[PDB]
């Protein structure tokens, strides 16, 4: 069956799009076929994000898959809320509840507020990134009032690519004079490797300093350089390599060609590609459940305009989202089930701590049970009293 | 400019008919006539208020709050405290 | 989007309009590529954006100059989200190098129904901490 | 190879002192050890 979908992949993103093909290959069905129409356009310019939304809506697609940014979060969720076309994304979750936009990426606010209380902090910097958003910054500032945390929040994503050395060095000398040992750096994989390399050169990574890479990809960053120094670098990892559904995928990931799927000949996977591969499973399972409980899936694909005065819904699109919310599968990230809003629920984030073996697991955060510290080997084995 | 103080003899005491009077004339004592001798030198009006909890006040160990009369000078519910306020170190760093 | 593309069809020369934190990312992108000038008295853009002209002066410099006059180091900061958060980034970066203990509390997400009970729970949280001095940073309807 | 293993272990904070006892002091990599706070003395035979 000819079912078409839409793509909004950014410029320079390749491992996310290579892991979109692999999910298209494995999760295909002879009963119903997904037809991707992919646009490699800039995700920052909301004019180009608007145009790609209309050209795919002129095709008559039933559900659009793509990424978005702070400069376009309020564009896509406004078009999808009005034109009633569902939207699947691994990008950052919106703060306000938005209908017709499903989010594959788990929210990490309650995990980050659980990890700080686990180490029992009271005074720590927080380097945030504006392009990531200020959503988590609102969480650890509103909860700072209730539990008395002397948070020194410093913007760091405004630092330009030309002059990054003198600004980062003038940054950490400020945290030294306030005696800020504990740092929660929180930014994408671009700005984690540039902060960590300036931590290495300044040498803020001896014993005594503590870090929390507050990304969902903890092994995704460079980790060997920060490892042996003696700085306890905690973090969060959404996909666990010993789940035996994941390690079957890693074998099939590494044994692909580099020239056919760029960025696929790797040992690890980015956390965006893990949710990109999971999202094809959810689009397949919901379209499969759209086929079992059969309805008129076929639509007269002659919308075209996207400037309709007034623009009207189409009521079968609500039936699509009601199937997209009604999904409980297993993937790389874990149990994938949604609420009536669109954020994920009954998911599980692994708290990873960095030891000299490499990444080491100490617990898992969850929604129904806050922070289950796992079975402990009494990590540094104590001398007898 | 509100002169706060605490009710300790002979620094601040009630007079004979404090219901019959109002304002400054409800109180007498050492600091009260000292408060006037500040006012005749610096030139400002004043109104004597008594701190409510009846403590000179020290920093709480956990909440780091000030109570008492230093709790009125730091937190701004009064402008000056002519009273038996013992010069210490923990009170020097918050009020002068 | 439609009203901007509507006036692009009438062939206007300059466009005067307002925006919010939702559509600040829309108009500055549309006016950038279509090369049409835009005039606004709303909150100014954060980074430099082409073709968009602001009639409203920036106050993030004047707010810092007012605080350094009164010699504050321990103040709460009630801010509204819907106006934008560009003022919050200024008084958190300047909270670093001048030794400020800012208690920045968002207030914009409060509903129409339970607004009186949460504000009572709000100012009581500034009484356990005893924050006397409070910067209100919100629109005229959220001030009163 | 020693300096890169000093950088990774982080033996180059303030308190550590080094003397590169070669005649070429600028000849080695020097930007990586510079900002850490380790006083790296040395010897240079040719003066620019």
UniProtKB/Swiss-Prot annotation, chain C:
Induction: Down-regulated in the pyramidal cell layer of CA1 in the hippocampus by global ischemia. It is found in: Cell membrane; Postsynaptic cell membrane; Postsynaptic density membrane. The postsynaptic actions of L-glutamate are mediated by a variety of receptors that are named according to their selective agonists. This receptor binds AMPA (quisqualate) > L-glutamate > kainate. Homotetramer or heterotetramer of pore-forming glutamate receptor subunits. Tetramers may be formed by the dimerization of dimers. May interact with MPP4. Forms a ternary complex with GRIP1 and CSPG4. Interacts with ATAD1 in an ATP-dependent manner. ATAD1-catalyzed ATP hydrolysis disrupts binding to ATAD1 and to GRIP1 and leads to AMPAR complex disassembly. Interacts with GRIP2. Interacts with GRIP1. Interacts with NSF via its C-terminus. Interacts with CACNG2, PICK1 and GRIP2. Interacts with GRIA1 and SYNDIG1. Part of a complex containing GRIA2, NSF and NAPA and/or NAPB. Ionotropic glutamate receptor that functions as a ligand-gated cation channel, gated by L-glutamate and glutamatergic agonists such as alpha-amino-3-hydroxy-5-methyl-4-isoxazolepropionic acid (AMPA), quisqualic acid, and kainic acid. L-glutamate acts as an excitatory neurotransmitter at many synapses in the central nervous system and plays an important role in fast excitatory synaptic transmission. Belongs to the glutamate-gated ion channel (TC 1.A.10.1) family. GRIA2 subfamily. The M4 transmembrane segment mediates tetramerization and is required for cell surface expression. This is Glutamate receptor 2. It comes from Rattus norvegicus. The lineage of its organism: Eukaryota, Metazoa, Chordata, Craniata, Vertebrata.
């Amino acid at each position: 069956n000819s079912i078409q979908i839409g793509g909004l992949f950014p410029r320079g993103a390749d491992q996310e799009y290579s892991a979109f093909r692999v999910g298209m290959v494995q999760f295909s069905t002879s009963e119903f076929r997904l037809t991707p129409h992919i646009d490699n356009l800039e995700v920052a310019n909301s004019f180009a994000v608007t145009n790609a939304f209309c050209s795919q809506f002129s095709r008559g697609v039933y559900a659009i898959f793509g990424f978005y940014d702070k400069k376009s979060v309020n564009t896509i969720t406004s078009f999808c809320g009005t034109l009633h076309v569902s939207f699947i994304t691994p990008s950052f979750p919106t703060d306000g509840t938005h209908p017709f936009v499903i989010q594959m990426r788990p929210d990490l606010k309650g995990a980050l507020l659980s990890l700080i209380e686990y180490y029992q902090w009271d005074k720590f910097a927080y380097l945030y990134d504006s392009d990531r958003g200020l959503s988590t910054l609102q969480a650890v500032l509103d909860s700072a009032a209730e539990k008395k945390w002397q948070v020194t929040a410093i913007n760091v994503g405004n630092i330009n690519n030309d002059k990054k050395d003198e600004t980062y060095r003038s940054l950490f000398q400020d945290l030294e004079l306030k005696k800020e040992r504990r740092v929660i750096l929180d930014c994408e994989r671009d700005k984690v490797n540039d902060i960590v390399d300036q931590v290495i050169t300044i040498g803020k990574h001896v014993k005594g300093y503590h870090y929390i890479i507050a990304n969902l990809g903890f092994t995704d960053g460079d980790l060997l350089k920060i490892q042996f120094g003696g700085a306890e670098v905690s973090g969060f990892q959404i996909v666990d390599y010993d789940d035996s559904l994941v390690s079957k995928f890693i074998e099939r990931w590494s044994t692909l060609e580099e020239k056919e799927y760029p960025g696929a000949h790797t040992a690890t996977i980015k956390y965006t590609s893990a949710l990109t591969y999971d999202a094809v499973q959810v689009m397949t399972e919901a379209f499969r459940n759209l086929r079992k409980q059969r309805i008129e899936i076929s639509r007269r694909g002659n919308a075209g305009d996207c400037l309709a005065n007034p623009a009207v819904p189409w009521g079968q699109g609500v039936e699509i989202e009601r199937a997209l919310k009604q999904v409980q599968v297993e993937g790389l990230s874990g149990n994938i089930k949604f609420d009536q809003n669109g954020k994920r629920i009954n998911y599980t984030i692994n708290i990873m701590e960095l030891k000299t073996n490499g990444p080491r697991k100490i617990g898992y955060w969850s929604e129904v049970d806050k922070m289950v510290l796992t079975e402990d080997d009494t990590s540094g084995l104590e001398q007898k009293t | 400019v509100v002169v706060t103080t605490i009710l300790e003899s002979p620094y601040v005491m009630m007079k004979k008919n404090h219901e019959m009077l109002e304002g400054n004339e409800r109180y007498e004592g050492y600091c009260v006539d000292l408060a006037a001798e500040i006012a005749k030198h610096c030139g400002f009006k004043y109104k004597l208020t008594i701190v409510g909890d009846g403590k000179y006040g020290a920093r709480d160990a956990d909440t780091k709050i000030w109570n008492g009369m230093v709790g009125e000078l730091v937190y701004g519910k009064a402008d000056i405290a002519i009273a038996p306020l013992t010069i210490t170190l923990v009170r020097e760093e918050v009020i002068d």
